[PDB]
A and B are shown apart, each in its own frame.
Chain A
Amino acid sequence: VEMLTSDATIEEFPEAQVSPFFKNIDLQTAKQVGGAQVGVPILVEFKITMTSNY
Chain B
Amino acid sequence: CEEPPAPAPPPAKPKAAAAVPVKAAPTETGAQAAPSYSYVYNPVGKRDPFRSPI
Contact = CB atoms under 8 A, between A and B. Distances in A.
Nearest to B42: A37
A36 B45 contact: yes
Majority DSSP secondary structure for residues of A touching B: loop
B8 interface: no
B interface, size bucket: under 10
Interface of B: 42-46, 54
Nearest to A2: B54
Majority DSSP secondary structure for residues of B touching A: loop
5 contacts: A2-B54, A36-B43, A37-B42, A37-B43, A38-B45
Contacts of B44: 36-39
A39 B43 CA distance: 9
A interface, size bucket: under 10
A40 B44 CA distance: 10
Nearest to B46: A38
Given A36-B45, A37-B42, 8 more contacts: A2-B54, A36-B43, A36-B44, A37-B45, A38-B43, A38-B44, A38-B45, A38-B46
